[PDB]
Amino acid sequence: MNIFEMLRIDEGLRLKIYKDTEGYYTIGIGHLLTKSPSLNAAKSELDKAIGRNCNGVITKDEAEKLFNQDVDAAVRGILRNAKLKPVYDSLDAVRRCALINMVFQMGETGVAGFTNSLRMLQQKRWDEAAVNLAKSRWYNQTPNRAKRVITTFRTGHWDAYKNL
């Protein structure tokens, strides 16, 4: 299993504009288009993102292209981030994937606010951090996904994703 396979389990694949768990306009593999309520604003972002007139619909091909960009940006964002970089550097390959997943879903900023859990992950206090991460909006709002990510940080193995 790798980062792409993991995220593709968590996000799914949709070739038509759709709404987030959050009500936001999205397409592909969890690619947020806009946080604006108009489908029209979303369509416009889409065409800007793909470089064509899409009419709200894209190919598999275009979906994966966006996904490659997104994962790349998530990693680079972690690397540029003063709060994120040190934790990332400290982790093993599998747990690194768990942090990338959180960044992809919630953005740099969002994850950088989990101060206390970050501190625990750096210290390698796996069970404590798993308990702390669960005390969040994130977990309450998307509990099955949060729990998969949390198991990953807890164990350092891919079991939460074997099932799936």
Side-chain angles (χ1 to χ4, degrees):
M1 177 110 307
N2 58 56
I3 192 61
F4 290 94
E5 291 173 356
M6 189 199 206
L7 279 160
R8 139 116 241 227
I9 282 152
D10 285 340
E11 296 289 354
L13 171 57
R14 308 234 231 321
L15 293 188
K16 197 85 218 302
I17 290 183
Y18 72 95
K19 298 188 185 185
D20 258 56
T21 297
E22 260 173 73
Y24 312 131
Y25 284 128
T26 309
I27 199 161
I29 302 142
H31 185 82
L32 172 74
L33 292 158
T34 181
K35 285 194 198 188
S36 160
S38 5
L39 211 225
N40 281 319
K43 247 102 100 78
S44 156
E45 282 297 303
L46 178 63
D47 286 5
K48 163 171 66 87
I50 295 308
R52 79 192 181 56
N53 249 71
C54 295
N55 187 34
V57 68
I58 65 171
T59 66
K60 200 171 166 160
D61 242 278
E62 285 169 349
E64 292 180 322
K65 180 191 274 74
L66 295 173
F67 186 37
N68 285 147
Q69 298 166 172
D70 302 339
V71 175
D72 193 63
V75 173
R76 283 179 317 168
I78 283 173
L79 306 168
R80 280 188 287 89
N81 193 294
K83 268 104 195 239
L84 300 172
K85 193 194 197 299
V87 182
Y88 190 85
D89 285 344
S90 73
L91 295 163
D92 61 90
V94 177
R95 297 186 166 87
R96 276 169 183 177
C97 291
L99 189 69
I100 293 164
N101 195 123
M102 296 185 66
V103 178
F104 184 96
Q105 187 185 355
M106 93 194 359
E108 264 207 22
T109 297
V111 174
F114 284 46
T115 293
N116 302 307
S117 312
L118 292 178
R119 223 257 268 70
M120 286 168 243
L121 290 165
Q122 248 209 96
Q123 283 154 202
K124 308 198 180 301
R125 296 178 176 222
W126 316 129
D127 283 82
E128 302 86 315
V131 160
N132 195 259
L133 280 165
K135 248 73 159 242
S136 49
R137 191 194 180 262
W138 169 66
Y139 178 89
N140 287 101
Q141 249 13 256
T142 44
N144 289 151
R145 172 180 196 159
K147 106 206 329 158
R148 281 196 287 284
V149 172
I150 288 164
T151 290
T152 306
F153 274 137
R154 213 197 321 107
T155 68
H157 289 124
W158 291 114
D159 312 328
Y161 291 86
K162 246 26 145 162
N163 299 304
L164 292 9

